[PDB]
């Protein structure tokens, strides 16, 4: 086509929008002409509310037409190197030109993709969030593939060249093989029943929410493993570079040894009776919802500990690095000395008769559902106090920066003078002979 | 005298400003010279962190030097019409020039003000938040005075010309007779024991948090009255233009008639046994913490009602305009039909056996501490549900956009499948035969 032949086709397309609607076709034709006149490489038509596109200017390398309401596309020029048409209503794509490198077609209604095996320059496909039931055979040199949130039931052969692969939230039931250069795999939210070998190049592996009984041998290179919400009976041996492990909501009976590189562990909601020796550099331990009789000696750098919902009868020495401690629902009769930098303590649902001396940086304290007869002095740093369901007849003087006081289901005869910036006061089910004066600041009051 | 004499004084003042250097003196001398060179009216030196100012350019009308660390000021030029030096550390002011019109010296440590009676052009003084024990005699033509947050124990004579007056948060115990043009008075947070006469021109009156037994006659012009936190036994007759009344936290035994112009009423925390007939155009009624046996018929436009902490045994017809209803802590055995546009219902602490059909726009529901045996169907609009302390054995299907579920202290045998974006689940003290699966989303969990 000559130059004025395009000008006609585009001015004709400009009228096929009915007079008075949301489409900025006049702005689009302005850009189409500017692009043709200057032989520009890029053409961006995004956020103009288009239902269709006219014949595209040839000799362009990049077409961005995302965030519109397109139903299909016109044939693509042969010079085209990248295509960005995400956030549209595309049910299918045209045939793709040979020089193509990027394909971004996520957030559409694509039911199929065109033939991909003959686009050797195509290195990135983001076709996530579509209605794809199946993938055609992939390009030779594909580096990045994202096809999450689709209805895939099986996978084609994956290239040697492949590095990043997201196939999560599909209907996969197995993975036959992975390429040797894959460094990052997300296969969450499928129905996968078994993995085959993992390549040594792998460093991030996320298989959350599948139906595994066991994992294959893990690469020594592997750094982060997420294997939550499966039916794991045990973990395989863990590599020496693994620093983050989440194996929660499985049926693990016992852990193998943990490497010294491990800094973050989560084995919540399993069948553990005991933990093995924790590594020195561990900073975050979650071991809730298990059957723990006791914890092993805690490492010097541990800063967050959640050992709730267990049957721990005795709590060992707490390291000074600890800042967040939760031991709700255990068999505790006493807590040990609380470390100075502690900020949040949750020791509810045990058999405590009293609390240790509270450290001076404690901002949140929940010691409800114990048999506590009186409260030790409260630090001024305290903002939230929950001591419902205990054996209290009186509360100590309340710190001035307290915002929430919950002390219902006790035997309180009176409440102390209330802080002037208290937000919440819950003292139902008590023996109050006199009700306190309520600050203007309290917005959520329950009493008597 | 001359131009280069100022240039010297300012370059001398520029050296020096230790601890070198929290002060932008070089930027300030730049503006001082630009101001002198161009004979400009304004000079702004705010947010430059100055500890002092040098000799000012004469022939300027406006000096803005707020948000600095000034301890005193240089003598002010005679041409000066306005002064803005708030947010500083001024302990005193210089003598003020005759042509002055605005004085903004709030947020300082001023212990006294200079002689004001001889500045006839001075029409606005904002000297609030200082350490003033006393005011000098005021200008003849003063229109606006703000001296809130000071240590005043008495007031000088107020001009005829005075319109707006804020004297709140001081140590006043009585009021020096008010001028006849005053349209707006705030005398909150003093120890005022008695008001004398209010001028007819008055339209806004705020005497919150004083020690009044009664109010003088109110002007017919009066539109908004705040008289909270006093010892009022009764209100005087209310004028026909009054649209906002807050008489909460007093000792009122009964209300007089309410004018039809009244749109917002608050008589919380009084000694009321009944309310009088509500006006048709009322939109907001707060009558909490009283001894109400029943409410009168509610007007068609009432949108917010808080009649909590009373002894109401029967609740009359609720108008469709109602959106926010709170009847916590009364003698209710049943609720009437809930209007369609209702969004928040709080009916906790009554004797309810069941709830009416919940309207479809209800987002927050608290029906705790009743004797409810089963819950009617919950609308999908519901985000927060509190039904603790009731006679429930099961919960209905939970709407999908529920974020908080509190159903502790019941007889629940099981909980329904939980919404996937639930934040809080509190179901302690129940009969759960099996515990539900906990979504990843729930961050605050309490259960048996």
Residue numbers in the entry:
A (entry chain A), B (entry chain C): 34 to 481
Quote from the publication.
Yersinia outer protein M (YopM) is a major virulence factor of the three pathogenic Yersinia species, Y. pestis, Y. pseudotuberculosis and Y. enterocolitica. Together with up to six other effector proteins YopM is translocated into host cells by the bacterial type three secretion apparatusand significantly contributes to the Yersinia infection strategy. The individual LRRs in YopM consist of 20- or 22 amino acids and together form a LRR-domain, which makes up the central and largest part of the protein. YopM isoforms of all three pathogenic Yersinia species were found to associate with the serine/threonine kinases RSK1 (p90 ribosomal S6 kinase 1; MAPKAP-K1) and PKN2 (protein kinase N2; protein kinase C related kinase2/PRK2).
The YopM_34–481 construct essentially consists of the LRR region and the two N-terminal α-helices that initiate LRR folding. The crystal structure revealed four molecules in the asymmetric unit. Analysis of the interaction interfaces between the four YopM molecules indicated that two YopM molecules mutually interact by binding of the C-terminal LRR 20 (residues 461–481) of one molecule to the internal LRRs 14–17 (residues 342–422) of the other molecule. The crystallographic dimer fitted the experimental SAXS data reasonably well (χ2 = 4.3), which could be further refined to a nearly perfect fit (χ2 = 2.3) by using a rigid body modelling to slightly change the angle between the two YopM molecules. Altogether these data indicate that a dimer represents the smallest biological assembly of YopM and that the dimer creates an interface that allows binding of one molecule of DDX3, thus forming a 2:1 YopM:DDX3 complex. It appears that the YopM dimer forms a binding interface for the DDX3 fragment. The first part of the binding interface covers an area of around 1000 Å2 and is formed by LRRs 7–9 of the first YopM molecule (green colored in Fig 3D).
